[PDB]
Design a protein around this motif. Structure first.
Motif, short mmCIF file in Angstrom:
data_model
loop_
_atom_site.label_atom_id
_atom_site.label_comp_id
_atom_site.label_asym_id
_atom_site.label_seq_id
_atom_site.Cartn_x
_atom_site.Cartn_y
_atom_site.Cartn_z
N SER A 200 0.55 -1.25 -0.12
CA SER A 200 -0.17 0.69 0.07
C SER A 200 1.08 1.58 0.68
N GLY A 201 1.96 1.39 0.72
CA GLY A 201 2.64 2.25 0.12
C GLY A 201 2.38 3.18 2.06
N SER A 202 2.98 4.89 1.76
CA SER A 202 2.65 5.97 2.97
C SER A 202 3.34 5.81 3.83
N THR A 203 4.19 4.58 4.11
CA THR A 203 4.40 4.62 5.70
C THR A 203 6.23 3.98 5.42
N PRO A 204 7.11 4.22 5.24
CA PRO A 204 8.64 3.96 4.85
C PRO A 204 8.57 2.01 5.64
N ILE A 205 9.52 1.73 5.12
CA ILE A 205 9.62 -0.17 5.64
C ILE A 205 10.30 -0.03 6.76
N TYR A 206 11.82 1.17 5.84
CA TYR A 206 12.44 0.96 6.97
C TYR A 206 13.78 2.38 7.32
N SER A 207 13.59 2.84 8.08
CA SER A 207 14.86 4.07 8.07
C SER A 207 16.23 4.19 8.43
#
Lengths: 493, 471, 600, 140
Positions: A200-207
């Motif tokens: 879906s996206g809109s939230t990073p997998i990791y930073s």
RNA sequence: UGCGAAAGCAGUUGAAGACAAGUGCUUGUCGUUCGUUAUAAAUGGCCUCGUCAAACGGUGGAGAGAGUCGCUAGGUGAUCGUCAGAUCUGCCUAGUCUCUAUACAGCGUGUUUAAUUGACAUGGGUUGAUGCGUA
């Protein structure tokens, strides 16, 4: 019988900071043209296809420079406010650019008149607009709105996906090769955010934390991503999600970064990194990213680029400066009746039973001094040693060969003050260098032993010896100093 | 070689032959072949003849013949240099011939230093035999009993011109040591370049060290790196020891001076050249050419015998172990460990076996009656050899005399089991045995001053066929 | 290599079966799966108390305990972690015999009790191997049966080696394949060795051999890397797999002195060619390749220490040189108490450096040849010298020179036979005792020139010879291995110029700068200052010695006023030193009308 | 051929205003040759001493290395740079003593200094002969 | 020559016979011997098979060359001079600054770790040798 040995040029032991094969290749970027532009050139990109013309963004205009001609061939001035990018599509047919107004314009490269698609990405400025490398249709856009919308050329009215989460300006977008789903963005937060478009996206997998505002993020290889921010650039591995290396040779804040692999250099892959200190330096990824070369420019460097791997012609190194100066460096890359009368020379004996070759390979022509040694012209070989425009190393040999042959007195018998002066004049200069100091010490002694009487009656030679006596004395002082330093060091250790 | 055309007094040349031409001939019904005898006067110890047969059509060697070409430390038997216009190092003038012959006989009879031992090497991969000839290496195949190669490993006036009259006094560089790594791909050479005479720089010898490499198929060694004046200026490299297989995979070596220095060189792939990895300071001003060096199979510790003292140096620290110091009665010649346990140390007077584990000498054999001063320091290195599995060997040669000494010699080999407890075998030959070394299979090879490499080791149709063949 | 102090894991309960210290170890079983290099847990089977798991670090603690009745004896115990139908689980398998009437095979699965099972085994269970990958428990019975069970103790396959009274069975993995070899005693000291490979039948016999002369009753056995180690009567016999052929026998003289019955010996491996041996309260770390005692540790506060198991390092592949071992320690006292103790072990680098000079095993010149060619009784002498009256110099020299046929007062190459070190050591003791004061025999002058002068006597020799100028001078010139400390202390205390120069020459020749520099640092600062004064008032080595003094002093210690006096002196020398040089080099180096009178 | 030559001594792998410290620390860190060279251009010994006094000890080590390669390539700059080297060794003597390895990190100095010091006896022999002939004809 | 380190430390170079030349005497010589560890110089110099141009890959570099009266530190000259300085808008050396085909030296590209192609009829004859170019 054996062919004659070729006289072996002298080689004194290697001194520090020798020329390396990496440097020898990069020094061939000789021809330098400086062009002036109205404002700071912000972004530079290369067409991935032949002839690989490169686009430069400056002020309100984009200019495409021919690879061979190195001159403007197309100009895109329709943009009302400043322009912020000129990336090509993978095919190289299209060119995308951004504006301060926020609109993103897609032009047909090499046809500036035609505009194919116009997109109102956001009301804020649109700094980064990159096409997707694996997939042609999807276009990415980054805004100061802090959302990196993923556009599609077919449907421009709404974004396919709208990545968010960055708390500061986003000015860096990278797509990881071999993982088209993945998208990498960097913000001035100091965080590099990795997203997956398949989800879906809109939230990073990791930073990944870079600890300084990130100025550009480049995916060096499918598993490694290098990001340049603040006063250093750090290479990250996604599988482990930790930094393999970091380099802090730079002084000013790195601004741009580019990568090229599999070109005809000795070094397989090169990482060029702008500095903002006037430097753009080359790092080698196969060697833990160690420096191998650097150039200095008049002002801060705001963009760098190097011609793609498949250059198929003269290579180019391009750098951009905030003063508007653009610096280009280039590595340049009878009758029929007669012919029928002699038609056999082309044949290489492919159909023949037996192939017999006896021709000896052609050897490089031997210099004059070597000809004289080989013919046993001792005295002439000495004269040829001291001729104008004779390389120092070659001269030192023909002195050594004669000494090695045991012909030092023989080469100095039939000489007077008229023809002895050249030898002393060289000796006056040879005595300084460490390499020839021992040899000149040897010859100078002989001529004294053999021309003591002649020296008295000739005034010119007398001066040559006073001047020589001065400089040999000066050399003693230098050597004596070196000993005192050497003793000084032993005390420390 | 000069062919004088007597019709017009012209000439044609065949230059740069391997040696001076003792003899020429035209051998054939139509002068098809020229037969030549060459001398190679460089080797003053021995008369090294080479027979050439050249095809007259194109003046190219149809058949080249020569025996093994060692270089002995001194002249042997009745060898006399050829006759020249002057008396030099490599030649004898008209008058000097008889007097030199007399002095030679008197030296062989009266004097006591009788060292003719010669350095030789055995190639691991190929088992060819490498002879360090003056300024060159001669590669000889003793299985087939022929020479395979002859390569010049130095600079100098080697084959650039034929030395004549005063030029003949020049001394070309001399290969003092030559050794191979265990893997067999790397060749180490140590050379001494002699400055010409009657110059300021006529007393500063130049010590050079070189590293070469080759693939197995190739036949010419290629020089890969060159060190000029290792260990300092004018300081000899007395000894070279290639490293064992454990450390750097046999890509290293140790070099030892007369001043007590150890330099450990290794091959660095990143650099792509050999580089000086470790060093020990040769600073103390004790000088002695008698130095021994051995390395344990593991590669952890190193045994360095200098003058009369032996030291155990850790490889990691490259310094004395933390008893490492062993005193001997006299200066050490040879230090070797036959097996990882036992260290066999030879001094000028005796030889001994020591247990490193116990640090107590087991056996001691007196050598003084046979080896007193006949051999210079460091040649006992090449007389003694040690196998890696079974045991070692000691070679002892003695002059035969009946009613003052006579030129003839007699040699004796002694096979010793490890730690010298028992004599596996005793043998006697009738000539001076110059060198005995361990070929890597079980057998040992030895070289005689006759240049003889001995080895010590464990119906009508049937008539019609004949008549047809006769025709 | 070193042994850490043992640290207690637990105190064994006071049970009758455990009252026998000699047989106590057999009653304590350690699981093979859980005790290795990288594990922090130990699972132990204490007969009649429980089977318990302990965590070793950071502090010993008990994690799990399964009580067992006091009347049961744990014959085999093994525990491994794995996944069972998936959940992470710990499988515990232990075999007990109650009065020999019935044998019990129990399997316990714990969630990381999920299940517990029990069956009646046909014979004593000696070895258990748990295969977590296949969820199989493999038990070895004393009657030679090899039974393969699932985690529910359902028999899947049973294999008989055709031999009974099995006494040893051990598991080992090679190249990804599991194996087991079993030793069965036979009559007349014969042993049946069979090698089995675990894979239609899951078990395949690879080797079977009969070994003669192999006794068990007094033999302690352990195995490591294809080598089987047997300790018997102080001799270690090494057999090599797969054929269990005897390669080497190592005699351990320390164990040969043990009276049979009183000394408690335990023997376990710790690394490649390295084993751990305990004799009562003394612990040894042995290198069997080189036959050396790497490390010895005595536990004075325990009567006996018995090994149970040790975690073995694969040193050829492992950079770790540190491991751990578990054993039973019993204290001294009328009411002895046994405790479980863990010992940390530093095996070392498995290299000859570690074993040099530490062997546990405890000369006359011989003519090289027994039989027309050019040639280029110590004890009796000692007894004769010893019989001499004190301070009888003439007889002492007469006996020594005459008996040994010594011609010169100084050593020569012709005296090699005398070079046996012991005789020299005794004679030196004779010289000291017989003679004291100002008159010493000429023998000492000969010994001082002897290259094999003992190191034991080198110390203080300069002090002893301080009285006589001649002997002192002789020592400096030729006495070998004079300590650098004494030379240096004597160097800066002498005011005599001649002895100063030679001591300089001797100090320089036999010692490197680095060694000398450290000793000069230990010295007092006044002495260097005093020496420095003598300079300002063959000179080659003396100057080079001063350069050593200057460096050892360092930057901080030197004083300006003294420095300037030096600064002036050295400049004078350099001016002279330069001056001689050009001297040395110099040594090596028509008229149209003229007037003349005829000679007529 | 292309074989590398070398030698045995290549131990490579074994207070006042006007001070130019700030430019110097940057020039060494960034390896900026042009910026460094302006710093080396000044010659006032009072300035040389003050710069090295405030330069961070860690950077001093690379400074010696940088001066070392300058001296080896350009002999004529031996004199002017040697004061820098002499001052760096003087002020930071304590820190240099407490370094794990010196031969590797100062190999270039040892290589450069050893080459010069070896020449001394040869030059003195040359000097003596010249004084012999120069004195001779001047008197005559 | 012996010993030794490479440096050196000690020690030698004697006697007979014969021949040649000059004038029994003098000197020089030895394909003669005994014994001791024990200048040169007969006008006399090394072959042919294929050259040339342009690339490419490593190895070295004192870089090969041209500018900047732009800086830094020295050295030093002509004439005059009231010795304080003047005019030559003085000269030279070194460093620095700017630039170019790395422009320079060398080994190879018959397979090597790496790296090549192209031109020619490799002949005979005629003119010029006061050749051609430059001052």
């Amino acid at each position: 019988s054996t062919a004659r040995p070729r006289i072996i040029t002298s080689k004194a032991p290697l001194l520090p900071q020798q020329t390396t094969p990496e440097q020898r290749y990069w020094r061939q970027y000789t021809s330098a043209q400086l062009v002036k532009e109205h404002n700071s050139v912000t972004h530079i990109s290369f067409n991935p296809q032949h002839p690989h013309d490169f686009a430069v963004t400056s002020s309100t205009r984009v200019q495409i420079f021919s690879s061979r001609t190195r001159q403007v061939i197309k100009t895109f001035s329709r943009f009302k406010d400043v322009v912020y990018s000129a990336s090509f599509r993978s095919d190289g047919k299209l060119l995308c650019a951004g504006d301060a107004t926020g609109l993103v314009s897609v032009y047909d490269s090499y046809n500036p008149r035609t505009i194919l698609l116009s997109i109102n990405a956001s009301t804020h400025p649109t700094h980064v607009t990159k096409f997707h490398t694996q997939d042609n249709k999807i276009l990415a856009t980054a805004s100061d709105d802090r959302v990196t919308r993923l556009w599609d050329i077919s449907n421009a009215y709404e974004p396919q996906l709208e990545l968010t989460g960055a708390t500061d300006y986003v000015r860096t977008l990278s797509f990881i090769p071999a993982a088209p789903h993945l998208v990498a963005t960097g913000s001035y937060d100091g965080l590099i955010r990795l997203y997956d478009t398949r989800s879906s996206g809109s939230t990073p997998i990791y930073s990944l934390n870079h600890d300084q505002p990130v100025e550009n993020v480049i995916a060096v290889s499918p598993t490694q991503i290098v990001s340049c921010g603040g006063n250093n650039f750090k290479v990250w591995d996604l599988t482990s999600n930790k930094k393999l290396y970091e380099r802090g040779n730079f002084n000013k804040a790195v601004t741009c970064l580019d990568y090229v692999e599999n070109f005809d250099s000795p070094m397989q892959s090169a990482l060029i990194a702008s500095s903002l200190d006037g430097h753009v330096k080359v790092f080698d990824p196969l060697d833990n990213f160690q420096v191998k070369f650097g150039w200095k420019f008049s002002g801060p460097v705001l963009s760098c680029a190097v011609s793609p791997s498949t250059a198929q012609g003269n290579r180019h190194l391009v750098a951009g400066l905030s003063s508007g100066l653009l610096a280009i460096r280039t590595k340049k890359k009878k009758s029929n009746n007669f012919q029928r009368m002699m038609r056999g020379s082309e044949y290489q004996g492919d159909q023949e039973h037996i192939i017999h070759n006896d021709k000896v390979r052609s050897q490089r022509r031997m210099r004059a001094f070597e000809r004289n040694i080989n013919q046993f012209k001792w005295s002439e070989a000495l004269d040829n040693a001291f001729v104008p425009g004779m390389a120092k190393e070659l001269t030192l040999t023909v002195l050594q060969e004669l000494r090695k042959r045991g012909k030092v007195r023989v080469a100095l018998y039939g000489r007077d003050e008229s023809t002895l002066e050249p030898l002393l004049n060289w000796c006056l200069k040879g005595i300084e260098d460490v390499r020839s100091a021992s040899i000149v010490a040897d010859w100078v002694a002989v001529v004294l032993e053999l021309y003591g009487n002649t020296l008295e009656s000739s005034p010119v030679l007398q001066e040559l010896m006073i001047d020589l006596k001065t400089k040999v004395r000066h050399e003693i002082h230098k050597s004596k100093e070196a000993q005192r330093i050497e003793g000084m060091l032993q005390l420390l250790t | 070689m000069s062919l004088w055309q007597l019709e017009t007094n012209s000439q044609q040349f065949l230059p740069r032959l391997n040696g001076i031409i003792i003899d020429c001939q035209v051998l054939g019904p139509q002068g098809n072949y020229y037969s030549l005898i060459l001398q190679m006067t460089e080797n003053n110890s021995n008369s090294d003849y080479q027979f050439l047969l050249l095809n007259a059509s194109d003046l190219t060697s149809k058949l080249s013949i020569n025996g093994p070409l060692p270089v002995f430390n001194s002249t042997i038997k009745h060898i006399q240099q050829p006759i020249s216009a002057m008396n030099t190092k490599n030649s004898n003038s008209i008058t000097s011939l008889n007097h030199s012959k007399k002095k030679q006989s008197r030296k062989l009879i009266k004097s006591r230093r009788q060292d003719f031992t010669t350095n030789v090497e055995i190639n691991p991969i190929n088992k060819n035999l490498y002879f360090p000839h003056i300024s060159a290496v001669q590669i000889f195949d003793f299985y087939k009993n022929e020479q395979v190669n002859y390569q010049y490993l130095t600079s100098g006036v080697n084959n650039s011109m034929g030395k004549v009259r005063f030029e003949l006094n020049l001394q070309d560089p001399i290969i003092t040591d030559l050794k191979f790594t265990k893997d067999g791909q790397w060749m180490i050479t140590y050379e001494i370049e002699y400055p010409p005479n009657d110059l300021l720089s006529s007393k500063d010898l130049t010590h050079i060290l070189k590293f070469w490499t080759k693939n197995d198929n190739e036949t010419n060694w290629n020089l890969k790196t060159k060190v000029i004046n290792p260990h300092g200026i004018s300081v000899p490299i007395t000894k070279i020891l290639p490293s064992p297989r454990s450390v750097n995979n046999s890509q290293g070596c140790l070099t030892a001076d007369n001043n007590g220095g150890l330099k450990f060189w290794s091959f660095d792939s990143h650099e792509s050249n050999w580089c000086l990895k470790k060093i020990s300071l040769p600073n103390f001003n004790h000088f002695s050419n008698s130095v021994s060096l051995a390395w344990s199979q593991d590669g952890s510790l190193i045994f360095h015998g200098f003058d009369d003292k032996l030291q155990i140096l850790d490889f990691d620290t490259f310094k004395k172990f933390e008893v490492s110091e062993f005193t001997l009665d006299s200066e050490i010649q040879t230090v070797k460990l036959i097996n990882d346990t036992n260290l066999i140390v030879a001094t000028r007077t005796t030889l001994n076996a020591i247990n490193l584990l116990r640090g107590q000498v087991i056996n001691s054999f007196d050598l003084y009656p046979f080896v007193n001063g006949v051999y210079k320091n460091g040649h006992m290195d090449r007389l003694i050899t040690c196998d890696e599995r079974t045991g070692n060997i000691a070679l002892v040669i003695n002059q035969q005399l009946t009613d003052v000494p006579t030129i003839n010699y007699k040699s004796r080999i002694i096979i010793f089991d490890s730690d010298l407890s028992t004599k596996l075998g005793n043998f006697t030959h009738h000539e001076y045995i110059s060198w005995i070394g361990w070929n890597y299979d079980t057998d040992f090879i030895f070289l005689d001053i006759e240049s003889t490499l001995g080895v010590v080791g464990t119906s009508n149709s049937d008539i019609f066929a004949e008549q047809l063949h006769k025709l | 290599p070193s042994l850490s102090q043992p640290f207690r894991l637990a105190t064994l309960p006071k049970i009758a079966s455990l009252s026998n210290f000699s047989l106590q170890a057999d009653y304590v079983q350690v699981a093979d799966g859980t005790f290795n290099e990288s594990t922090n847990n130990i699972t132990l089977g204490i007969s009649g108390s429980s089977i318990s798991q302990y965590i070793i670090n950071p502090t010993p603690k008990l994690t799990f305990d399964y009580p067992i009745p006091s009347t049961n004896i744990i014959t085999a115990c093994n525990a491994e972690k794995g996944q069972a139908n998936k959940r992470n689980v710990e499988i515990w398998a232990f075999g007990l015999m109650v009065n020999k009437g019935n044998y019990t095979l129990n399997v316990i699965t714990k969630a990381l009790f999920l299940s517990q099972y029990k069956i009646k085994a046909k014979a004593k269970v000696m070895s258990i191997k748990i295969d977590t990958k296949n969820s199989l428990v493999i038990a070895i019975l004393q009657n030679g049966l090899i039974e393969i069970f699932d985690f529910k103790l359902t028999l899947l396959h049973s294999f008989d080696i055709s031999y009974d009274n099995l006494k040893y069975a051990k598991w080992f993995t090679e190249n990804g394949t599991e194996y087991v070899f079993v030793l069965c005693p036979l009559q007349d000291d014969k042993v049946c060795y069979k090698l089995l490979e675990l894979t239609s039948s899951p078990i395949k016999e690879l080797s079977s051999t009969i070994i003669e002369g192999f006794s068990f009753e007094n033999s302690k056995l352990c195995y490591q890397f294809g080598k089987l180690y047997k300790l018997n009567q102080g001799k270690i016999y090494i057999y090599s797999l797969p054929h269990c052929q005897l390669q080497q026998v190592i005699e351990f003289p320390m164990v040969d002195k043990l009276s049979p019955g009183d000394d408690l010996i335990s023997f376990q491996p710790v690394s490649v060619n390295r084993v751990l041996l305990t004799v009562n309260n003394v612990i040894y770390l042995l290198d069997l390749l080189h036959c050396s005692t790497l490390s010895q540790r005595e536990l004075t506060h325990v009567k006996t220490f018995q090994l149970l198991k040790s975690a073995v390092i694969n040193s050829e592949k492992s950079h770790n040189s540190k491991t751990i071992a578990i054993g039973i320690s019993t204290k001294n006292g009328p009411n002895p108490t046994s405790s479980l103790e863990i010992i940390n072990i530093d095996v070392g680098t498995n290299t000859l450096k570690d074993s040099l000079g530490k062997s546990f095993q405890v000369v006359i010149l011989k003519p090289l040849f027994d039989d027309r060619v050019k040639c280029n009784h110590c004890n009796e002498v000692i007894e004769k010298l010893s019989a001499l009256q004190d301070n009888d110099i003439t007889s002492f020299d007469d006996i020594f020179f005459k008996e040994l046929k010594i011609k010169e007062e100084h050593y020569t190459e012709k005296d090699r036979y005398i070079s046996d070190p012991g005789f020299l050591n005794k004679v030196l003791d004779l010289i000291f005792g017989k003679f004291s004061g100002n008159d010493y025999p000429k023998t000492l002058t000969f010994l001082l020139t002897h290259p094999l002068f003992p190191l034991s006597r080198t110390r203080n020799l300069l002090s002893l010879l301080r009285d006589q100028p001649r002997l002192f001078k002789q020592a400096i010139v030729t006495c070998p291995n004079l300590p650098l400390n004494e030379l240096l202390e004597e160097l800066f205390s002498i005011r005599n110029r001649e002895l100063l120069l030679d001591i300089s020459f001797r100090i320089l020749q036999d010692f490197t700068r680095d060694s000398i520099k450290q000793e000069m640092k230990k010295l007092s600062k006044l002495d260097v200052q005093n020496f420095i004064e003598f300079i300002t008032s063959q000179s080659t080595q003396l100057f080079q010695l001063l350069s050593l003094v200057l460096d050892s002093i360092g930057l901080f210690s030197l004083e300006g006023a003294l420095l300037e006096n030096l600064t002036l002196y050295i400049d004078k020398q350099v001016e002279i030193a330069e001056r001689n040089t050009e001297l040395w080099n110099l040594i090596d180096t028509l008229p149209t009308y003229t007037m003349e009178y005829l000679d007529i | 051929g292309n074989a590398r030559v070398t030698s045995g001594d290549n131990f490579k792998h074994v207070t006042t205003t006007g001070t130019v410290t700030v430019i110097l620390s940057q020039a060494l860190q960034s390896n900026d040759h042009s910026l460094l060279e302006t710093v080396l251009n000044n010659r006032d010994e009072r300035v040389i001493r003050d710069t090295i006094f405030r330069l961070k000890p860690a950077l001093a080590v690379i400074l010696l290395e940088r001066l070392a390669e300058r001296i080896a390539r350009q002999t004529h700059r031996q004199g002017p740079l040697n004061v820098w080297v002499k001052w760096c060794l003087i002020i930071h003597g304590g820190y240099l003593v407490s370094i794990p390895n010196l031969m590797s990190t100062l190999s270039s100095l040892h290589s450069t200094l050893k080459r010069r010091s070896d020449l001394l006896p040869r030059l003195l022999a040359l000097d003596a002969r010249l004084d012999c002939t120069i004195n001779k004809f001047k008197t005559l």
